[PDB]
Structure formats: C-alpha cells, structure tokens
Amino acid sequence: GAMGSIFTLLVEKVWNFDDLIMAINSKISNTHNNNISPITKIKYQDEDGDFVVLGSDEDWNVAKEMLAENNEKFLNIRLY
C-alpha cells in the first residue's frame, strides 16, 4: 500500500479490539476467491491531527472514550 488509504467506519461503545478487527478484516479481506491476506496491526487518527499506533483493547477503550468525549463515533485507519 504505497498509495495510502483510510477506513472511517462506525463503531459502538461495546466493540472490542476483536470486533474492531472484524470490521476492518471484512473491508480488507472478506471475499473468498483464491488467496487472502488479513491484518491486525493498524493505525488510527488520534485527537492530535495525526495517526498513531494502537496497541489493542487498551488503546481501543481509550480511543473510544476520546471519540465520545464530544460526539464522534467514526474511527479512521491507515495502511502503512
């Protein structure tokens, strides 16, 4: 991915890092044709105008509280 793409979806206040990876995995590799290549480690647009490195359920529960800290529910993603 030398072009650079984003993934802004709608997450809930219950979605775990697992459920999160499912959404992405469904938008990155959900079709069964021949061979697929899923992912796990991804980046997200933090509240500082710059993508950061998300750990797991930890940075997920934190990043979540940051979204609802105002009125945001969508989460951005990167493909490094």
Q: Method of determination?
A: NMR
The answer to whether 46 and 63 are in contact (CB under 8 A) is yes
DSSP state at residue 53: E
Closest of 24, 32, 19 to residue 5, by C-alpha: 24
Classified by CATH at the fold level, domain 1-80 comes out as Ubiquitin-like (UB roll) (3.10.20)
Residue spans of the domains in the chain: they are 1-80
Tokens of 66: 């940051």
Phi-psi region of 49 (alpha: psi -120 to 50; beta: other; left: phi over 0): left
CA atoms of 68 and 41, how far apart (whole Å): 23
The answer to whether 1 and 28 are in contact (CB under 8 A) is no
CA atoms of 79 and 57, how far apart (whole Å): 19
CA atoms of 79 and 71, how far apart (whole Å): 26
